[PDB]
Every structure is written in C-alpha cells, then in structure tokens.
Amino acid sequence: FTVTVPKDLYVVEYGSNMTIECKFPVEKQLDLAALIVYWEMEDKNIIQFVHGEEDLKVQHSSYRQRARLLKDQLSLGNAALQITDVKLQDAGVYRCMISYGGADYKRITVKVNAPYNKINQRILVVDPVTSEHELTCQAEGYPKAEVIWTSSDHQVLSGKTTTTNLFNVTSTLRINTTTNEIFYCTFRRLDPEENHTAELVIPEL
C-alpha cells in the first residue's frame, strides 16, 4: 500500500482555487467502511475523514468554509483536497495520510504568490478652478511594495504612500493638471524586482 502524489509542489496565486491530489489504490468499488483520510498542515487539522463521516467542528478555524475533500474523487482513489480563495497562510507543507488496508502518507509543498496586479485607481477633481487633481492608486499584495509616480515623460513625481495591514498599499498624488494628461502609478516589490503599473488619464472636468 502506497500513497502517491502527481505533484508535490504547487505554486498558486492569491485568491485563486486549488485542488491538491493524493492518490491511493482502489480496486473497482471503494470500501468506505475501511477508509480513513487525514489532511494536515503544520499542526492544523484540515480533513479528518472516518468511514464517510466528517465533523466540521474539528477543522482549523483558518480553513473553515474554504477546505473540502472531494468525495467524487475519493471513489476513484484520489483524496483530493480543494481549497477555495487561497490565502497567504495556506502556504506550507501539507500532509495527506490514507488508511485503507494499510497506511501511508505524502508531503506536498504549497507556495502562494500575492502580486500587486489588481490596482484600483481613482481620479478626483478636488479644485476645478485651480485644476488641482487628486490621483490615487491602491492594491493589496505581499511583500511590501513601494509606489512610484511618474509623468508621461517618465519623470518621477512625489506622492504620499500609506501602508497598513497581506499588505494594503495606497498612494495619492496631488497635482495641478489638465484633461488627457497621462500619469503612471507603479507598485514595485524587490528581491526579485517585480513591477505592476496602472495608467491614469486625466478625464474631462
């Protein structure tokens, strides 16, 4: 009796859905009365499956309403763990243990990437007479990102960035400008360098 994993490394994007496969030999008809399934992640209990019975109250709080064992896959020898809306705390080493006329287990490493690729922008006309505009870009991600404001000719402009807690980074640029002028807000993380940029076009008043 051996449990096998087709992949022991998963790299997943924040907020996505993930199914970790965990295979074990089943001959034709699954004997539910002899099957135990245990999904664990670094002292956190995810799935405690006994002869078809699960009790959601023993599932760790951080996984509640997000982690489930696919019963359809179980019948075919695949103790597949599905995690929806993946978070940063889902990164780690998962252990899937199967008891089914013998017992075995395998480790699966999960990495979660949270890039700043969803930039929310807004442009406010705070004073039409003086043509003063307030440009704001906000994004969530990990790790910490700096925000660089540039003009259309790529000259760096001075804005105000506020970082609070996954990081929530917002930055605001107050500038006197006119319709159709173009500005860029760039969210930059390092080690290694990764950039995500939104283009902001000054609209009609």
Binding site: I36, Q48, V58, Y105
Partner: peptide, 15 residues
C-alpha cells in the same frame, strides 16, 4: 485518533 469528532495530531494521535 480515529474519532472524527475529536482533534487529531501528527501522526495517528490525539490533538
């Protein structure tokens, strides 16, 4: 272990 209503711990133990 292996009561589905009780917490478990690695490996095949009480949690």
């Amino acid at each position: 272990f292996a009561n589905p209503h009780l917490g478990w711990s690695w490996x095949x133990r009480x949690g």
